[PDB]
Amino acid sequence: IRVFAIPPSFASIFLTKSTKLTCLVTDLTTYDSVTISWTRQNGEAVKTHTNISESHPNATFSAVGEASICEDDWNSGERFTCTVTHTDLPSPLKQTISRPKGVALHRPDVYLLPPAREQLNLRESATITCLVTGFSPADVFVQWMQRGQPLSPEKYVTSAPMPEPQAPGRYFAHSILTVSEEEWNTGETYTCVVAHEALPNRVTERTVDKSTGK
């Protein structure tokens, strides 16, 4: 019997423009009188949470609640409590989460990897990697654009941020894009806009054209 809380990443902040937190409950049967609350540091009011998840066939229930909060309030380290009181456990249990402060702010350096010459001799495809290296927070958001309009999530997979090996502590990730060849010839600069909390304007983009390795 455990209760799991997922804090909002910077990646989930940027695409939705509104931060929120969840709290899933495991190994608790599908009963009623589910107690879900979210409190501030002073225990103030909370936006209502709806859309309770379905009942799992293995006699377990996971209630999902979403609650809004300010951007600056999440970065200040304010503690939230996930108080749960079910029929099996009348004693309330509180799951405490906060911002893990204590990590430096290093701006990401982004070097996007072009198509190579020996690739573009089969005349079949182009594949691109957007290496987002050297940033000290562990939360980056990477998405791709084409001519200024954002690209579908079907075309890219952003890695999870791993620590850089040769540096003692600093994180890195990257994303991949797989595209065509004739489309590469005319247009499609393929901007990889990467957002990080340590950038001054919170947005950085890199892109290529044909005349990059010329």
Tell me whether residue 63 or residue 193 sits nearer to a second copy (CB atom): 193
Shortest distance in whole angstroms from residue 32 CB to a second copy: 25
Tell me whether residue 28 or residue 69 sits nearer to a second copy (CB atom): 69
Tell me whether residue 87 or residue 212 sits nearer to a second copy (CB atom): 212
Shortest distance in whole angstroms from residue 39 CB to a second copy: 12
Shortest distance in whole angstroms from residue 72 CB to a second copy: 4
Task: Please give the full DSSP string across the chain, using - where no structure is assigned.
Answer: -EEEEEPPPHHHHHHHTS-EEEEEEES--S-S----EEE-SS------------EETTTEE-----EE--HHHHHTT--EEEEE--SS--S-EEEEE---------PPEEEEEPPPTTTTTS-S-EEEEEEEEEESSS-EEEEEEETTEEPPGGGEEEPPPEE-SSSSS-EEEEEEEEE-SHHHHSS----EEEEETTSSSS-EEE---STT--
Shortest distance in whole angstroms from residue 142 CB to a second copy: 12
Shortest distance in whole angstroms from residue 90 CB to a second copy: 26
Neighbours of 183 (CB within 10 A): 13
Q: Which two tokens stand for residue 1?
A: 């019997």
Which parts of this chain interact with a second copy (CB under 8 A)?
14, 17-18, 44-45, 68-73, 107, 109, 111-119, 122, 125, 127, 129, 131, 133-134, 145, 148-150, 153-157, 159-160, 162-167, 172, 174, 176, 178-179, 193, 195, 200-203, 205-206, 212-214
Tell me whether residue 91 or residue 201 sits nearer to a second copy (CB atom): 201
Tell me whether residue 103 or residue 157 sits nearer to a second copy (CB atom): 157
